[PDB]
Amino acid sequence: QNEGHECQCQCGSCKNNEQCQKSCSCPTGCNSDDKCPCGN
Ligand SMILES: [Ag+]
Ligand SMILES: [Ag+]
Ligand SMILES: [Ag+]
Ligand SMILES: [Ag+]
Ligand SMILES: [Ag+]
Ligand SMILES: [Ag+]
Ligand SMILES: [Ag+]
Numbered sequence: 001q002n003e004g005h006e007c008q009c010q011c012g013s014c015k016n017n018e019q020c021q022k023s024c025s026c027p028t029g030c031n032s033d034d035k036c037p038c039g040n
Contacts, residue, residue: 001025003040011036 007014007021008028024038
């Protein structure tokens with residue numbers, strides 16, 4: 001669960017919706033769409 005980072009999602013849901021831009025284990029590399037089952 002490595003989500004102690006800055007939301008690094010290059011999507012439109014994270015890059016914008018800051019409701020989940022602070023606790024997602026996305027390994028600051030998330031750059032795909034079927035690799036973002038993030039909701040927080
Ligand atoms: Ag994220
Ligand atoms: Ag995302
Ligand atoms: Ag992403
Ligand atoms: Ag996200
Ligand atoms: Ag986010
Ligand atoms: Ag995420
Ligand atoms: Ag993601």
